[model samples]
Target chain A: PVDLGLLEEDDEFEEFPAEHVWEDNWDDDDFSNQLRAELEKH
Target chain B: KDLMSSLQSARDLQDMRIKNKERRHLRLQPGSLYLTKSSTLPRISLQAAVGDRAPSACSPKQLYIYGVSKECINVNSKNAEYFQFDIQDHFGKEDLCAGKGFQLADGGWLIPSNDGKAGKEEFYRALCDTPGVDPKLISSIWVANHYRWIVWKLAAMEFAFPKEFANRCLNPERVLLQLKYRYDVEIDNSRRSALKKILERDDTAAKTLVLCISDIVDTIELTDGWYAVRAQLDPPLMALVKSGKLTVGQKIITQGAELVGSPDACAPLEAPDSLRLKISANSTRPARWHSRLGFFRDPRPFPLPLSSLFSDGGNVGCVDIIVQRVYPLQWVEKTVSGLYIFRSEREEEKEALRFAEAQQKKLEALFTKVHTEFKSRTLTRQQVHALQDGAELYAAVQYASDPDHLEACFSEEQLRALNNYRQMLNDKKQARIQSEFRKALESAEKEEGLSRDVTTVWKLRVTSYKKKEKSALLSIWRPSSDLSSLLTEGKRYRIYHLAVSKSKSKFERPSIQLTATKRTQYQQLPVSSETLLQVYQPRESLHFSRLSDPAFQPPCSEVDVVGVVVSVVKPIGLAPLVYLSDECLNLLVVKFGIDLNEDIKPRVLIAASNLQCQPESTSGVPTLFAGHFSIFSASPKEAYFQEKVNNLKHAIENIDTFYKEAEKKLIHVLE
Candidate 1:
């Protein structure tokens, strides 16, 4: 029972500069892969 | 019987000649080389290993080539000729041999003819053109010959090895002794006293002494195209140290130098003249010609202590000291008659006070005269008193007088006349005071000594490493601009060859004054953390008692406190009041003469020394006051306070995040 409208309105999940996430979570494969998948879609 | 004896003597003579010839042949065998005298064109001779004459372990052969001493023969060129050197061995021992052929001693002359030139060519060609011979061996012969030639030339010119030759040579010291023996020049090896003794005796006698350049001072401009420098002699010959050519720790040789005494010693009552070496302009040419006196840098450390200088007969030497304070440059005056004149600080102060009293007396006399004039002119006691008591005459007359009193005092013409008289008296007073002050100061200056030209003086309060408590004042008279820049407060320096003299003035306490003469030089030492701790560390341990504790006495108690600065309250025209806290209690700190400057930042750890504890009776607040000699250091280097400093720093970092979070929560509540 997830509210899609509520999830869309959440500003905390806004996109950041590519380098910030890449440097911050460089060791984590899940974060890197998620970034890569998002970028591939873009 | 007589005829038989004669024949026996004749036979004995013949046998002796044959034996001598055999010995010479053995000495001049193939592979032997020789150096000709430098009086002629310098050249070398080698006995070539030709045909069966070639040297081996078993058979060594000599080639006989005899000739006159000074004949020129062309070996490689027809027009240009090489000096013919004889193949005959002359040295008592076979010339010092590195190998079978390498001879490093004198040789005889060559036979005068075109054959000598052909012979010389053959000697060189055979050594070079031989197939099985090592090229390095032939090169060594040429190099050794060239080295000998250079040595002869240097000896002829009365110098040691040139800079490059000395550096490249394998045994410069060995060759140096060889040159000394060849030239009969007695080399002075007593390195320490060689220069020192020369200066002490004021001996200008020519000497060949080896010395090291301990220090090189900045070049001082003397006149147009003329510059002078004072170098600290490891052991002063005033030789012109070429700018950039010389440095500290360089060994040099002094052939001769002019001994010049201190320039200020001509004045009566002046300090004893310290002798210095001044190599004249004529000698400077020789210095330039043989510029690189030292081939290598000396490794030994030549450190003279300040304490040793006083005990060691006060000989002119150097000492290492730390600069505690630097006073401003004071101008000293000299008389027109070329006499040096100066006044001590205390004398100048006393003269100033005398001048002020005289000036005040004149002003008071003028005030009294104006008061009497007012009284004679029928002015009231109150008006006269007001005028005499610093009130302007016009203002007093206009404001303090009633219309009836004004008319009763004087007519309009009389009032105008009285004002004119007052103006005249004021003008006279000013002129007299100025003239008298000038006259008095000048008279005092004349009584002290003479005045025409002025020179800058620098004073430094310096302390030694061994005894920091016994600080000495170093007064540099007429220091060069570059010297002043090198000296900075709170820096360490090893000042060399300063003239030590006792002060003669009775007004000031008699203490030994160190003066920088022509030979004085200095080197700055890097500051160390240990020196910092020694200089500024407080006498007592840091106090941790709270204001309420019985041990925390006040008024007379002095304590050193280290804590994080919580707040700074800067008052207008007053020292900043800093509140330092130790997490449990806040202590108010006030600076008297010490400037906190940028060190008074919040959350910065500061260690304050010699802070006078204030009683809780005054505003019931704990306070500490810093006096003139009180020291303040941010994050002191003392290991004893490292734990305290770390704790304070940790608390500051912890509270920083706590305060930020608290501010955020407070904003949320308010919103």
Candidate 2:
């Protein structure tokens, strides 16, 4: 049910589907947290 | 008998006074006695003296009758003209006195006489008029007279009072005098020849010598645990040097050093029998030494070339060279043990040894079982052939239990369990051996102590600037860690007093080496103009790459990158991790060794050099690691790099705007 008007303009945005678009906020996600935790332990 | 003798003495004194009055003595001789009477009593007094009365000094000599009055004098009394208050003799002695040609009186108070006052003023005026008199002595009449006494005493001893004696003297109520002597040893070039003349004779006269060290030949260890060196003096005296407080190309002044005819036995073997200055080791009357630079009256000697170091068979000289490369710092570890031996003293060692032996036996049993199973393999022909040799069989057993190797040998599930049991037994064996060794070491330490030492060491490769092929290796032992910054590669330096040696190998040619010792000194020289021109040549363009490239290997290559910082995470007591993104939109993580402090922030342009590429995890995301030698520059100096950095900043901003727009559109659709 996502709008396809702005999504169709850029070829770079075509790699992501509507349901997977939310994963782009990976800066604050589990991967960044796990990397930070590993660095703190050292 | 006592009363008759006293009456006779009184009659004699009265008769003498009457005869002196009858003589009408117009002038009184100094140091002569006189007599006087008051009502019914008689008194005796001495004639007061003034001026320089010695046979050498003859001036307008004045005489006065001197006496100590029993009461203070009144200036307004009718009899005041006879007493004088301020009459001082050439010896600076003061007393109450009656003027000459005046009759002495008893119970008649003395008053200040005008003639006596004029004589006292004339005496002080003459004292002040003396050449080299201290002006501060005019603070009081008494102090001036005391100062005259001091000067007269000094003149009698053929010495003159110092000009600053007035300031040095404390004159309150009573005068306190002081004298000081200062000895200043000559430290000029003139003394250099003076020292040479002194050393020529066998008089052993102690003299303070100013010496410029031309060369340090060798250092010797004394029998009493002291160190002595043989130094070639600039004035050309063979010196038996003591103390570690000297360096080559330095100037020193020594006191209480005596020139001996023969050199000490501990001196250099080839040293000549010329006069030698021996610096004794006793601290009480030992030779006092002082050193500093720039004491040379002439220009310092030039540094010798490295290639010609051993040409004249002299091992000591200053060398000017450039450092080609610097190696990593290393530690020399030494374990000094086994000095003490004792019989089996504790049960811990015995129990540990038994446990280790049992584990070894179990490991042998596991290997035997594994070998038996591998021989009767219920597997394919490939698997059976792979396990043919002992080494191959061991490798198969190691991997057969791993989950990924299950497909190759499906029928050997029991084989996998047996291999796991063998792995457990091998781990126990290693652990048992380690514990046993530690236990035995602890037991040994209980009886006698052991020492483990780690000394810091490093090396550098240097070559002559003119002759690049003439290179030498410098091995530094126990150097300060701060020397690392000064010993960087691609730098020029002048090293002084380095000990040179050659390796003694029979099969190959000897390689020359330079070693840094306690007396070695390093001075960094400025880069030459020609070398600066060669180093500042145009370099290659910067290389850019994406962080997610498959070809980006970990820890293999050094990469140069420029980007805008996106995020930074700093953990306590560790290097900071900074995330940067370029035009590729792929973020690279940089672990910088030095503190970025407040200089690094989001959206700041950063250019890094020589960063080691590493993998963050199994996911293969490449990260950059900055080490001690890595460099980080913020807002690079060149225009070309600045333009590229600006483009990265624009790319990051565009990505941020695009992400925000995309998120808004998704929220609108969900509503």
Candidate 3:
């Protein structure tokens, strides 16, 4: 299985709260397109 | 007459008494030397206001220029140059200001007023009739459309020709001196004696005031002991320049670590008579900054949301802060019914503006009191005059320069004369103190005196208080208008300077001047050690100062709050990294790239790194005026990251020692 290192070693990496939810821009077309294609295939 | 008619007459008479327009509001205090307190224009005109700053944190003050001919704004000043502004829109609703009409921060608005003797009364009537208006909310229209004028700061240099100063003699632009150049108010009243007597009266206080302003102006000119000549400059810009010097330049490590940057400024100009000037001048040499003791900065998550976090600076105090203003992105669990959220956009804006207006009112109330305190404590009208007119003050009153004629000021205008004297001395004193303090601090910091206690990784969190946190309410509690009244103002850990003459040992002969309690209190408070805010002005009483009005120092329903300190300050020049217990800790690293330029050649920089994060920002931001505050030490890793960031595109943003990703990404991207 492909491996990605689990984040560790520093308090900053440990304590960072979830990325502020508003940081995501819902208006992106790529994100929308993936959702649309999946819906059509379903 | 019919009984009914007689009864109606009696009732009408009774009603007339109630309708006589007996004062609907409290009478306001008059400006000591104004024709009218409020402009007679029916409404607050927004003619000269700058911009959207009005309804936001970038609240610049709207300055009104009065006392000119009906067409005064256009006419050239007889004495000095003026900042020119244009009028854009004029209507009854609001004065529409455009271009520079809105920006008043260039030394504040210079208001030129005209007053015939009769008009002087009118000025007082207006001043007394109207309550104080917020400098911020002074109608933008008044600044904009009504007049073609500009906001100005009086960089006036005046020298009093009179033996002793009088309230009327203060305006150097003309008036008192115009009537006669001499201080001939010598009547049996006695206090209006010559210049020297007045200067000797409050010599100690005058000196302290001089010290305070001298710090800010960077220069103070004193002519003989009686005369104080004051100059001016930006206080905040100077501090920033000082901090910046820690970066670029050679270290005179042995001569106590002077920041020897290429743009060789930040030096003292030794003027005559305990006076000096400090300029953080820019040089043709390439600018640079370096520091062994790196300042604290947050390791913000990479990819700064610059736009979201900031707004353009539009007005004097407008901060591009990250705070939410009546609007936040997240929806709350405690949902207001649709009734609470107005459906229309206009309604929403109006609500936000209304909230802004209320907050503005609170802040303005605080600032008004602060301004009043400043005028009363530092330089009264005569005192301000004495400062402006330093040379003549030295000539008229022999005692002013003599230090001997202390008893001659026992007459009527004695208080006014003393205030003028103090104002003169303070201007000189402030300049000297500031120059010395800055030199000493630089020397000490270079020596690594009282260095930071811990190198441990410290976190930085800048809490942009969701909305504008209103200005602090300064408790300006003072007992008397005379400089001599400060004896009872003493309290622990309160850093105030009282200039007073006292005997060497409470029994000694000639009273010598002293800073009554500065030494003991300067050492006590923790913040006092790290935080030093100099006050050229002290709290004043109403009886003596020419600037004081009965309306100020109003009778309180409750006794004024005393003894309990509301705020704390540290000594000057100490770089404080103190933080709230809630400071989020982090593993950090700091790096700086030392660079040197050789003519037109590409600059070479030595790369260096030390892993450590530290707390930044002191007790939030320290506000200089009504609406502005400083953001201190905003970056740590950027010292080194800046090198890579500038050289390469798509540079790594926020990275700490804890984040191995930073080094890996830089290596992969660059290598």
| Candidate 3 regions with alpha-carbon error over 4 angstroms | A1-42, B1-182, B186-202, B207-228, B231-518, B521-671
| lDDT rank order | 1, 2, 3
Model 1 interface CAPRI class: incorrect
TM-score of 1: 0.27
Write model 1 residue lDDT over A1-42, tens digit each, in one string. 221112111011111112110111001121111100111111
Looking at model 2, residue B261 earns an lDDT score of 49
Candidate 2 residue pairs that clash: none
lDDT of 3 at B447: 48
Q: What is the TM-score of model 2 when looking only at chain B?
A: 0.26
The candidates' DockQ values read 0.00, 0.00, 0.01
The models' CA-based lDDT, in order, is 0.40, 0.38, 0.22
Which 10-residue window of candidate 1 chain B scores lowest in summed lDDT? B220-229
Q: After superposing candidate 1, which stretches have Cα over 4 Å from the reference?
A: A1-42, B1-303, B311-317, B325-350, B356-459, B465-471, B477-489, B501-513, B518-523, B530-671
Interface RMSD of each: 41.2, 50.4, 29.2
lDDT of 1 at B232: 30
Worst 10 residues of 3 chain B by lDDT: B249-258
On lDDT, the candidate that comes out on top is 1
- What are the per-residue Cα lDDT tens digits for candidate 1 across B1-671? 12234433433443343434434322221221112121244322111111111112111112112221112211111111232333333222353221122223222111112221223332232233222222233333332332333322222111111211222222222232232222221112212122223333432242332332322343221100000124232211222344332333222333334444544212111223343444222111111111122211221123333433332122234456777655656556566667665543333445557756676666555445445633265446755444443325456555653644653455455456557766887898888777766666665554444222556678776766554444556889888889989998677788765664334243755334667877677888787777565642333435454445765453226566788665666779987677666634434456454456466786577876557765552342456786543556785775556766676666567766674344334333433
